From Swiss-Prot, chains A, B:
Outcome following mutation: residue 458 to I: In 1.1.ver mutant; promotes activation
Transmembrane segments: 5-25, 86-108, 148-170, 359-385, 412-439, 449-472, 498-529, 555-574, 576-594, 613-636, 642-662
Compartments where located: Membrane
Protein's gene: OSCA3.1
Protein name in the entry: Hyperosmolality-gated Ca2+ permeable channel 3.1
InterPro entries xref list: Csc1-like, CSC1/OSCA1-like_7TM, CSC1/OSCA1-like_cyt, Csc1/OSCA1-like_N
Effect upon mutating residue 367 to N: In 1.1.ver mutant; promotes activation
Superkingdom classification of source: Eukaryota
Keyword Cell membrane: no
Ranges of the Extracellular topological domain: 1-4, 109-147, 386-411, 473-497, 575, 637-641
Length: 696, 696
């Protein structure tokens, strides 16, 4: 990317960000847009902003978000969003300290050296002004065999040290948060249950429930209570949601009749557009009653001769249900596979009744398909990186000469199109990845979400970083590789290649934090949909919650994006140490914006008690792995022996991973028998702990 | 190795084997050598051989060893030696089926081809008759780009299939054996105890025992019984064994006095050789009584202000002690690390009181030291492989010309010296490896033994195979690599190199099974030591057991050797498919000999209930990994594209490892809550379950 395209993209993103901030500052203090700007404070009866009269100083949302403790977030949102905020805080601290040391000593060294302007004379491009004024401040203006590479090696060394320190402190802190939240938890149904799964069939005349009982009733006498057999109820769920659909439609028809004093009309055809006309109220009433009768018959008939191989088993104490979830129940780890029962809000009832070979086959095939689509998205990654360097792509396939003649078209294409394409592809990714993760037999929503995050991290790393960087290198160097000496191909490739991808990543990250956080704070897209789904034909009856329900923070899409930006900022923290500023800005603005949203907008849908965060630590340290490796390659592709001194860094990163896994990881999987025994329950009902898991 | 040296080594080994078999056949049926040939049947009051009169047909030890069921071995020896026998049986079956298919179709193909005699004319050694008549029956007589390589690829494919099938069947069978042995076990002290380890210190006025209690007394009320704090008692053990030494010495003095009616005399100096003379009985008596008083004082004073951080905690039920060993007890996996308590015969009381960072540091440093000594034994591996090819080592360092002129000296050196050196080094290995394994903080003898076996497997694989093979290649090819084309260096190296190491391995394996099993059945070394420690000055008093106690099967030295021979036989099952015969003979003779020894000689010292065998399966499949890789390299160093078709074999070997780990491994670590609940105890004493763990 040239300097003109970079400046145009920055200007457009900043202008849009300012416009959206002005829209947010105006709309958010209007009483009309209270359901859409303070949904987490109006769904809880909490007086959206403070009680006094005309107030709400434009910059008041920054005073309540910057002065909110981490206990306020846990109390108001949950210990699962405070984990997101400690993730953001520790990434921001890593990049802040790294910038503080890196930038004042690595930017002058790159700027004052002259490898560029000495590689345009030796290679004699004549002219090919590909290098921009922004590429001088990168590890491509550094000459071969230079003492400044010592400062760059010290820089990667210090980034590794800072990352280790902050990861250790964060992982201690998250362990403390989880231990505090678990110890003070109330009586919840998921603390008394286990997920018995992969059970055999009764080889006699005996129902599955009678087999689950008299089996745990002999292992756990006087401490085992009941069991829900995971009955296959797909069609039951379908019929019940269809019944609920006609219940809501009849409520809408009644509201319309009350409003207009006239009987509404309905069409019996598809989607009520083309078909025979019938009265809404009578048809909906009779269809509702027939559906009620048919649903009752189906619910009665669910218990059938077919045998289901999954269950939820409830114990009378927290200790028994916590100890009898980490134990082995049969001397064949196939049968009676027992884990902690997820929340009733988190069970994937469809993913139960899947045996061990089935799960393993599904996992392997899904992983193979993920690799295949890794390649299939590596193709459009090549397209995007090709579009970024549009001027250098005039020499290849010179058919594009007529369009790339005038600066305006080339500038707008370079500054907008690749980012939009990358956003489109990486936005189609999350839904497919979450669907694939749920298809492995994973029995909880949190585990499925974090597995989708892991698959998206594989996508991010390989496709985004490696594909975009390598494609930038090739489209920037292949046509200039006419001679093939190994002494000249390496330096030409490296120097004239990598910081170009670095600059494109600056542009992409700036686009992300500016326009994304503008669209998130201003919230116009959910505000345009609202006030339009309300005043037009939709939203006839009250049904207040359904129209403006905020929803989850969507860690299946948020954390993958934050971690992609993390990976990028670890990419060019040393190669082009201007990504550090953009990463700091991204994560600081993310802190501010997401703090405002979590305090006031988003409401969580499940509580994993910070279980996600070890995955985050694993992936951050995986980025550190990858880019200690990248520094290993680069320092050495500059043809001087700084390669050796990074091997201890890679080895100590692996050792740090093992040590952190050994010292804190095991406390995240389970709840200890200290938060379970001495939590001093108050004689739990055990009856609404049961049937809090029942789907109906 | 030439053919003459190979024949001389085989003849010497077979002659020694026949001599030792004749000695065994004569000595073992003499009533005098009953304690030394039937110790596992005289220590149990079992009438060493059958009750009748003059009998014991020379070939009767083969009728009782070939017609002994696997339940007889479990009843008489244990379910831990039946695991060794299923290991031997499955390796023998793998190699038997592989020979059955391999040999009739791979030996004629190698014999009828003429790559050799076409590589001595192209390279024009003139003359360098390095190739022996035994190298024609190997994958070095196969020409480049030949259709016989298709049969060789099918051969490695079929070996992989047979190994997968036999590993699956064996691992099912061992799971069944363990489930049968655990379910029928009696009341043992290790089923009611857990090993609480890595505990904090009481930060107040409170003893460690009072801290262990009132902690598990709140997690486990009415199901927790007592706790042994792992008091540091090194000097207590030293003083007690010193007291026992003088007790035995006084018993010996009393026996001598009774025998000769004279008072024995003792020297107060070092080892009683030089020093002042004193009466034995009076001095030993007064020293015994002072030691008794001092031991009582020390035992009283053991409980001190210093705080010990390990314990053994006893529960009142098998279920509680089995469920409260897989659970997490504190929400910090540092503190209160709990595992299943090993047997009282298996606890390493010194390795307790070691915290998590200490254990991790010790593990990492010990692994680094193991790699360092891997290299330091790679040096003598090079020496051994250099001595094997003595004739080719005349061209290098030609100073050895005078000694290598006459066939006799060269033949005897080649046929004896390398094998003796390899045996000496690989025999010094086990003690060091077992000492290192115990220094990692491992709390049981079985785990330490199997960790030493793993380290020895690393030694075996890397040093023995890779070092010996590569050194044979280099000493056989470096002086003949005058030109450096890649088209000719590869084929020369491969073909004229690998089967030489193969032949040396034939010789080594033959030496092993012949002379080792002759010395094991004949048992002359323990029989020369006996009958000499008895009739000479030693063994004055009765003390029958101490003189001829057979001891454990020593899996720390046996299984590593069997697995080294396993690795070798997987080496040259295809490259030189004559190793298959030697491996079959080794493992069949091992079956017979070790069956006779386990039925009649060796008595186990601990019972791990087949816990070792997953390590064996892991290592067998690791050999399959390594040599699917070796076939991948070799088929392709023959310069035709059979490389690709082995990648699915490597991938499916990894997948098979994961699947076997998933389906059976978890049942070996713990005892299920089916063999613990419904085992129907009979009101265990719980008092001799306690203090069965007390060292004194
Ligand atoms: C240490 C490295 C471990 C690597 C293991 C790979 C692996 O596990 O495959 C599977 C993974 C996906 O697992 P997950 O959903 O994130 O697991 C969630 C986990 N339970 C958690 O708690 O979070 O990942 C996948 O499902 C996809 C794996 C395909 C990898 C694609 C490779 C690209 C090919 C091109 C690369 C060229 C090579 C250079
Ligand atoms: C002068 C020209 C101005 C050019 C304007 C450029 C607009 C860029 C829009 C960027 C939008 C963006 O940043 O993400 C918007 C989304 C991606 O959401 P996410 O980051 O994964 O997380 C939030 C998630 N959606 C959630 O629900 O929590 O992204 C999507 O899901 C869909 C992306 C489609 C973008 C199409 C833009 C319109 C084309 C350009 C319009 C300009 C016309 C003139
Ligand atoms: C260097 C530090 C490496 C740190 C990681 C260690 C590693 O790679 O694997 C670790 C293994 C451990 O073996 P084990 O104790 O027998 O396992 C016991 C286990 N519980 C069991 O059931 O059995 O392996 C070991 O810890 C034993 C030694 C590890 C290193 C092996 C030497 C590598 C050879 C290098 C020379 C190559 C030249 C050619
Ligand atoms: C000139 C011609 C000489 C003709 C005679 C050749 C004698 C060969 C002696 C080799 C002995 C031999 O093969 O192994 C002898 C033993 C067995 O082997 P292992 O695998 O370690 O088994 C360990 C088993 N678990 C155990 O009980 O231990 O190995 C051991 O466990 C101990 C190894 C000590 C090595 C001592 C060998 C000295 C050679 C003596 C030279 C003979 C001079 C004449």
């Amino acid at each position: 990317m040239e300097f003109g395209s970079f400046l145009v993209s920055l200007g457009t993103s900043f202008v849009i960000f300012v416009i959206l901030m002005l829209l947010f500052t105006w709309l958010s203090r209007k009483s009309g847009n209270a359901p859409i700007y303070y949904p987490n404070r109006i769904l809880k009866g909490l007086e959206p902003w403070e009680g006094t009269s005309l107030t709400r100083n434009p910059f008041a949302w920054m005073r309540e978000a910057l002065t909110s403790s981490e206990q306020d977030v846990v109390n108001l949102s949950g210990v699962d969003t405070a984990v997101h905020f400690v993730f953001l805080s520790t990434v921001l601290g890593i990049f802040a300290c790294s910038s503080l040391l890196l930038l004042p000593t690595l930017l002058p060294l790159a700027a004052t050296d002259n490898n560029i302007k000495n590689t345009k004379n030796a290679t004699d491009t004549t002219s090919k002004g590909t290098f921009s004024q922004l590429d001088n401040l990168s590890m491509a203006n550094i000459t071969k065999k230079s003492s400044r590479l010592w400062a760059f090696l010290g820089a990667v060394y210090w980034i590794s040290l800072v990352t280790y320190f902050f990861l250790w402190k964060a992982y201690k802190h998250v362990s403390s948060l989880r231990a505090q939240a678990l110890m003070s938890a109330d009586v919840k149904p998921e603390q008394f249950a286990i997920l018995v799964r992969d059970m055999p069939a009764p080889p006699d005349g005996q129902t599955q429930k009678e087999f689950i009982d008299s089996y745990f009733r002999e292992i756990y006498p006087e401490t085992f209570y009941r069991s829900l057999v995971a009955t296959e109820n797909s069609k039951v769920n379908k019929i019940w949601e269809k019944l609920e659909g006609y219940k809501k439609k009849l409520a809408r028809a009644e509201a319309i009749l009350a409003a207009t004093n006239n009987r509404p009309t309905n069409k019996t055809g598809f989607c009520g557009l083309v078909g025979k006309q019938v009265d809404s109220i009578e048809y909906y009433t009779e269809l509702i009653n027939e559906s009620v009768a048919k649903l009752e018959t189906e619910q009665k008939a669910v218990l059938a001769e077919k045998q289901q191989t999954a269950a939820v088993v409830f114990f009378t104490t927290r200790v028994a249900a916590a100890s009898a979830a980490q134990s082995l129940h049969c001397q064949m780890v196939d049968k009676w596979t027992v884990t902690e029962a997820p929340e009733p809000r988190q069970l994937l009832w469809q993913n139960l009744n899947i045996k061990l070979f089935s799960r393993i086959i599904r996992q392997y095939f899904i992983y193979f398909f993920v690799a295949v689509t890794i390649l299939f998205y590596m193709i459009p990654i090549a397209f995007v990186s090709a579009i970024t360097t549009l001027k250098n792509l005039q020499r290849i396939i010179p058919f594009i000469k007529p369009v790339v003649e005038i600066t305006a078209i080339r500038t707008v294409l370079e500054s907008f199109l690749p980012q939009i394409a990358l956003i489109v592809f990486l936005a189609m990714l999350p839904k497919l990845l979450l669907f694939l993760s749920k298809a492995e037999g994973i029995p909880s929503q949190s585990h499925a979400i974090r597995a989708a995050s892991g698959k998206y991290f594989y996508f991010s790393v390989f496709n985004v970083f490696i594909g975009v960087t390598l494609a930038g290198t090739l489209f920037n160097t292949v046509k200039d590789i006419a001679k093939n000496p190994k002494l000249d191909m390496i330096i030409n490739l490296l120097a004239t290649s990598l910081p170009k991808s670095a600059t494109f990543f600056l542009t992409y990250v700036a686009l992300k934090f500016f326009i994304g956080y503008g669209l998130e704070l201003s919230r116009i897209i959910p505000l345009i949909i609202f006030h339009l789904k309300k005043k037009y034909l939709c939203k006839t009856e009250a049904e207040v919650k359904e129209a403006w329900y905020p929803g989850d923070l969507s860690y299946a899409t948020r954390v993958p994006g934050d971690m992609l930006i993390l990976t990028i900022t670890f990419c060019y923290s040393v190669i082009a140490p201007l990504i550090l500023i953009f990463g700091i800005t991204y994560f600081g603005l993310g802190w501010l914006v997401l703090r405002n949203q979590a305090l006031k907008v988003y409401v969580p849908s499940y509580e994993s008690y910070g279980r996600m965060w070890p995955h985050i630590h694993q992936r951050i340290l995986a980025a550190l792995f990858l880019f200690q490796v990248v520094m290993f390659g680069y320092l050495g592709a500059k043809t001087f022996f700084y390669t050796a001194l990074v091997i201890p860094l890679i080895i100590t990163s692996l050792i740090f991973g093992y040590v952190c896994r050994q010292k804190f990881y095991g406390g995240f999987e389970h709840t200890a028998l200290e938060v379970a025994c001495r939590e001093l329950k108050q004689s739990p009902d055990l009856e609404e702990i049961f049937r809090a898991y029942i789907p109906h």
